[PDB]
Nucleic acid binder design. Structure first.
Ligand SMILES: [Mn+2]
Ligand SMILES: [Mn+2]
Ligand SMILES: [Mn+2]
Ligand SMILES: [Mn+2]
Ligand SMILES: [Mn+2]
Ligand SMILES: [Mn+2]
Ligand SMILES: [Mn+2]
Ligand SMILES: [Mn+2]
Ligand SMILES: [Mn+2]
Ligand SMILES: [Mn+2]
Ligand SMILES: [Mn+2]
Ligand SMILES: [Mn+2]
Ligand SMILES: [Mn+2]
Ligand SMILES: [Mn+2]
Lengths: 94, 99, 82, 105, 99, 86, 106, 97
DNA sequence: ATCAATATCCACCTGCAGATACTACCAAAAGTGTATTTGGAAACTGCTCCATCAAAAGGCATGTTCAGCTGGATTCCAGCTGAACATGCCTTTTGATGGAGCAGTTTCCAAATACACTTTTGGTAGTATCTGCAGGTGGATATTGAT
DNA sequence: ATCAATATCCACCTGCAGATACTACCAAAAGTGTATTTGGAAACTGCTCCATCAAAAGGCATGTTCAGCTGGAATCCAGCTGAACATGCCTTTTGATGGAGCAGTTTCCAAATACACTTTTGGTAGTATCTGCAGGTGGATATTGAT
């Protein structure tokens, strides 16, 4: 047969961080999966346009960051940018 | 005299009831019949995954519910509480679905 | 009885959709108007879904066919894949 | 052997996000930090929704998040509602809302 | 004795006149100052290609003309000939610009 | 040197300019409060597009907003514009 | 002697350029040889369709040179082009004459 | 120093113009509109073909993806005529060499 | 004001569908390490075009007066649409049952990429000469509004 | 109806911006040919899940009656908003100039891809236990609408 990848185990991991005693139904998990795939596509797509517009062949964290700023409203963008920079700094120092 | 609620009272009760819930409001089989009939006009002898029909009913009900909200704002704009064909038509024209 | 399929979308069901839309009072002409609107929506979405089916050389419309069709129509739907 | 995710402090899979960027035909090349940054953004947005949805569950005296709770969380939140303005949540219904002019008396 | 057209006659003449032409209707230098002012509040020390300013003005006027068409339909829906703030607001709500 | 401070330029969108735009949109009669309403709606529209355009400018590390910055900004907000290098 | 891929396909629009734009656009890993032929032909045909209607509008206005106004009249007066380009703004195109009937004098 | 080449569809738009309206000219701003139009439609079709391939786990965009993209993107009659012109051009192209 | 008819809510209870925890198996995926390659930052700088200045002038904004006719308020009543209730029709359920066809696997070839080389061409630049039509004028026709 | 004030039309014109023409030039584009690689079509097949069937059962659609109250028609009038005018500011236009900064060329190395090899993990499939909450109860009390 085959395997179908999803974000289910990682969504669940994040759920236990924010609400340790809270569960999630499979239908709701499906919605979370759709959400993550959708935002992935939006950000990757915008980052793609950004690189192309500037005649670059590489998508870097700088393209991901400008994309996030273009796509997310105000405060969501601020915190996402912060979390993004934090994860790239920590990854670099390791 | 036997009991009667005033016109509108039960209508408001129903609004509260259905805005509270999430279940689909069109009957499944008749919806299923409609979908297969429309699809048959594009390609014959089709089959549907059960989840394909359900995805269509979720999308379609959400669309109509959203449309009825806009329609309701158009009726209220003209100082009515009754929605009419011209309210639906105005909403769809401003949404850019037509004309 | 020999009724059309679009006519199987009943007045009470349309009533319930309007109630969830916050509608208190409904003109008798709304029901036929709604059916016509409903049909155009289904035609638009199903046409695209079937175009994806045909491209994949399938005879079965899948949930993803419908999801891709809803997305390009600007009606993105969560919960059925993708 | 230590994963890029653990290396970056993330629950979301960096290696997968990288592989999805390459196969997605987004560009000829993908920098090393791009999947890390993107994975972090997706984890955070996921955390924000589950936070608000969990709260919605607790407010309805439930312990398990269902689609309805996701919808309440998103539509009641100004920014999530904007980000997801053209999205339909299956089995989410709508917010309680009755135009004032329709109320009796 | 002095000649007066009736109220609305000249307004209709003006509709025909501007619907026939394509020239921008907002004065150029004031629009450019508005663009510079807003931009400066986002980021200091920006310069603009002149075509960038023109592309903003073309887009802005097209948006507003299109918005006034929708607004007009909302007024007429309420059995009025006069557009009001609430017509604009209903148009923008149904468009999903403030939904 | 520096230029005079820019302020209150929204008022440069005059009542007759707004009347002309309304006429192109087919409007026969106009309430007195429409003019301030229109200024507010225009400012929001301009801010949104300019914000996205300047974001493109900065990402390119330029100090000059280009017509393409604007075209790209208009495109991503679903206001595709022809005629300026699309 | 070499024939262009355009001449070989019977096309005015450039097959070679269209093929190059498809590859540089990161649309897919590979591009079949038929793809830019079919695409160049469709673009040519839509161009033909718009220029046909735009030149008629120019003629209707006693002009021999197409300007953006004629492009806008052609598009908005044609139900299918209007639909395809329904979220497009044509610079210096203006709008179709159209006064709501209720606004006319009695 | 030479300012680099700016490619456009102008000479091709112009050729098609002379086919449909031999004595009709076109202004440079109208030509600017036409150039935007061709780029716009190019990207819309190419993007839809890209998605279509990806959905079906294909790494190759062939004329078949272009054709389905054209049917998804264009309304009724335009799609019909575009499809026939597309198909004709491909069959003519392969019947050669 | 009272008072009765229903709707609505809270507490508690219990069955089960769907969530969990478990072991185990395994291909794909993710990490690691090495060798090779190259995208694009840095440096330098030509050269476009952007900011700014001046200076004259008339198109157009501003502010006012006046009153036509619009919007908003009121009243009224015909009739449409909501509520209630009696039927009975058909959707829903569920459980089994062929078998369509989705999807996995294997094979192998037309068509793809990669590369070296040669020819062709569309874009820029430099001047130099047509040409469609904007905008001005004048005078005939059409439209509007008063009577 | 008539007639007068004013807008609108159309023909005619001229200036010129902008379109056309032509040669020179050239880097990149495009085509031809050859070698090498491989995506995905084709045929076959297993197993998922889709269509259909019967078969009650009752939930919910339909038809009908009755009237509450809503939509729409009609009438009034206060005052908002359009039309016309006087005034004169500031946008527009034209042209020049310095120099910011965009963009073109070349250099060069941090970081990319490309394999090969090894280790890990997420998806899976059975198998078994567990539990959050839907749905049903009764009984309190809130709401509604008649007096
Ligand atoms: Mn400021
Ligand atoms: Mn290089
Ligand atoms: Mn003044
Ligand atoms: Mn008066
Ligand atoms: Mn009135
Ligand atoms: Mn079979
Ligand atoms: Mn040439
Ligand atoms: Mn003229
Ligand atoms: Mn293979
Ligand atoms: Mn009565
Ligand atoms: Mn009323
Ligand atoms: Mn400098
Ligand atoms: Mn594991
Ligand atoms: Mn319960």
């Amino acid at each position: 047969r085959s395997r179908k990848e999803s974000y289910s185990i990682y969504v669940y991991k994040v759920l236990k961080q924010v609400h340790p005693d809270t569960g999630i139904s499979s239908k709701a998990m499906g919605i979370m999966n759709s959400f993550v795939n959708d935002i992935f596509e939006r950000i990757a797509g915008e980052a793609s346009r950004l690189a192309h517009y500037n005649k670059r062949s590489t998508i870097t964290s700088r393209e991901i960051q400008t994309a996030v700023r273009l796509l997310l409203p105000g405060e969501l963008a601020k915190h996402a940018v912060s979390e993004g920079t934090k994860a790239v700094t920590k990854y670099t120092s390791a | 005299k036997p009991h009667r609620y005033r016109p509108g009272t039960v209508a408001l009760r129903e609004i509260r009831r259905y805005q509270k819930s999430t279940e689909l409001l069109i009957r499944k089989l008749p919806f299923q019949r409609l979908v297969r009939e429309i699809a048959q006009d594009f390609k014959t002898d089709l089959r549907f995954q059960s989840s394909a029909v359900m995805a269509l009913q979720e999308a379609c009900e959400a669309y109509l519910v959203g449309l009825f909200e806009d329609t309701n704002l158009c009726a209220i704009h003209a100082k009515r509480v009754t929605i009419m064909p011209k309210d639906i038509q105005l909403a769809r024209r401003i949404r850019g679905e037509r004309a | 009885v020999l009724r059309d399929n679009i006519q199987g979308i009943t007045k009470p069901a349309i009533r319930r959709l309007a109630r969830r839309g916050g509608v208190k009072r409904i003109s008798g002409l709304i029901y036929e108007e709604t059916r016509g609107v409903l049909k155009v929506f289904l035609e638009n979405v199903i046409r695209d879904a079937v175009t994806y089916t045909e491209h994949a050389k399938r005879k079965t419309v899948t949930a993803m066919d419908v999801v891709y069709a809803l997305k390009r129509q600007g009606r993105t739907l969560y919960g059925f894949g993708g | 052997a230590k994963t890029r995710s653990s290396r970056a402090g993330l629950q979301f899979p960096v290696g997968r996000v990288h592989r999805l960027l390459r196969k997605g035909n987004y560009s000829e090349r993908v920098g090393a930090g791009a999947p890390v940054y993107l994975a972090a953004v997706l984890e955070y947005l996921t955390a924000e929704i589950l936070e608000l949805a969990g709260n919605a569950a607790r407010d309805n005296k439930k312990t398990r998040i269902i689609p309805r709770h996701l919808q309440l969380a998103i539509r009641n939140d100004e920014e999530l509602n904007k980000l997801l303005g053209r999205v339909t949540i299956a089995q989410g219904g709508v917010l309680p809302n009755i135009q004032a002019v329709l109320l009796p008396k």
